[PDB]
């Protein structure tokens, strides 16, 4: 079994991939502290999402290959939806969360691809996209309930570590909150794509028509980097 126990007891090198373990070394104490927090939650008769083994999932793909950042706020509050990658759901989830449906609509309009068969964004993560939530856990059906609990330092470290590399980075920033992250990225070889959030509350205010995927690839090519294969089955 993998989860909060490993977060408290095991070194980062045993939790995340090698590049990420080095990049996140400054928040090694904080990850341990978050394990403690989750241990305290369970003791008090509360649950958290996603599964323990998925909390740090975004950092289980090669740090050296990350070329695009997509930031979310916190995990889906619907139990079974959050899988440790921002916006992603398990391949069996139907229908997908409305935010993801909106992302996929723009995906089809921008790229001309057919609608994906399922809501699993793992291929993006396997191809160099960091699907990072700012807060990595949440109490079921209680959005933002773990905000300010200590995850912010960890995910800030991830962002700043990425920016610290010489390599080009495209940051796709959806919503007002994600926009306030620009200062974290300013020291790097980075370009931001900014739009309203794909949430139904704000998607039709400018997310649709924003074409973030083709734009990200254009910017990467311009910066001399490999584009992302955005194609989903």
How would you explain this protein's 3D organization?
- The protein has 233 residues and is an alpha/beta fold.
- It has a single domain, classed as 3-Layer(aba) Sandwich (Uracil-DNA Glycosylase, subunit E).
- The protein has nine helices and four strands; from the N terminus they run H-H-H-E-H-H-E-H-E-H-H-E-H.
- The chain has helices at residues 4-9, 18-23, 28-43, 98-111, 122-126, 151-164, 176-179, 182-185, 212-222, and strands spanning 68-72, 129-133, 169-174, 190-195.
- It has a four-stranded parallel sheet, sandwiched between helices.
Which features characterize this protein?
233 residues; alpha/beta; Uracil-DNA Glycosylase, subunit E; Ura-DNA_Glyclase_AS; hydrolase
Q: Give the CATH H-level superfamily.
A: Uracil-DNA glycosylase-like domain
* Total of domains: 1
**Outline type:** globular
Give me the count of strands. Answer: 4
Q: Provide the CATH topology.
A: Uracil-DNA Glycosylase, subunit E
Order of helices and strands: HHHEHHEHEHHEH
CATH-derived architecture = 3-Layer(aba) Sandwich
Number of helices: 9
Radius of gyration: 17 Å
What is this entry, summarized?
It is classed as hydrolase. The chain is of the alpha/beta class.
Secondary structure layout plus pairing:
Blueprint: H1 4-9, H2 18-23, H3 28-43, E1 68-72, H4 98-111, H5 122-126, E2 129-133, H6 151-164, E3 169-174, H7 176-179, H8 182-185, E4 190-195, H9 212-222
Parallel strand pairs: 1-2, 1-3, 3-4
């Amino acid at each position: 079994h993998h989860g909060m126990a490993s977060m408290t007891a095991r070194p980062l090198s045993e939790l995340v991939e090698r590049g990420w373990a080095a990049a996140l070394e400054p928040v090694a104490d904080q990850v341990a502290h978050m394990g403690q927090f989750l241990r305290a939650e369970i003791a008090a008769g509360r649950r958290y999402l996603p599964a323990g083994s998925n909390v740090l999932r975004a950092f289980t793909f090669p740090f050296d290959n990350v070329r695009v950042l997509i930031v979310g706020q916190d995990p889906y509050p619907t139990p079974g939806h959050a899988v440790g990658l921002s916006f992603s759901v398990a391949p069996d989830v139907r229908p997908w969360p409305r935010s993801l449906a909106n992302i996929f609509d723009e995906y089809t309009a921008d790229l001309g691809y057919p609608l994906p068969s399922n809501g699993d964004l793992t291929p993006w993560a396997q191809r160099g996209v960091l699907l990072l939530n700012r807060v990595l856990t949440v109490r079921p059906s209680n959005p933002a309930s773990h905000r300010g609990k200590g995850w912010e330092a960890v995910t800030e470290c991830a962002i700043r570590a990425l920016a610290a590399r010489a390599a080009p980075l495209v940051a796709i920033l959806w919503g007002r909150d994600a926009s306030t992250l620009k200062p974290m990225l300013a020291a790097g070889n980075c370009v931001a794509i900014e739009s309203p959030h794909p949430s139904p509350l704000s998607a039709s205010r400018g997310f649709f028509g924003s074409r973030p995927f083709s734009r990200a690839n254009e910017l990467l090519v311009g910066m001399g980097a490999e584009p992302i294969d955005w194609r989903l089955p």
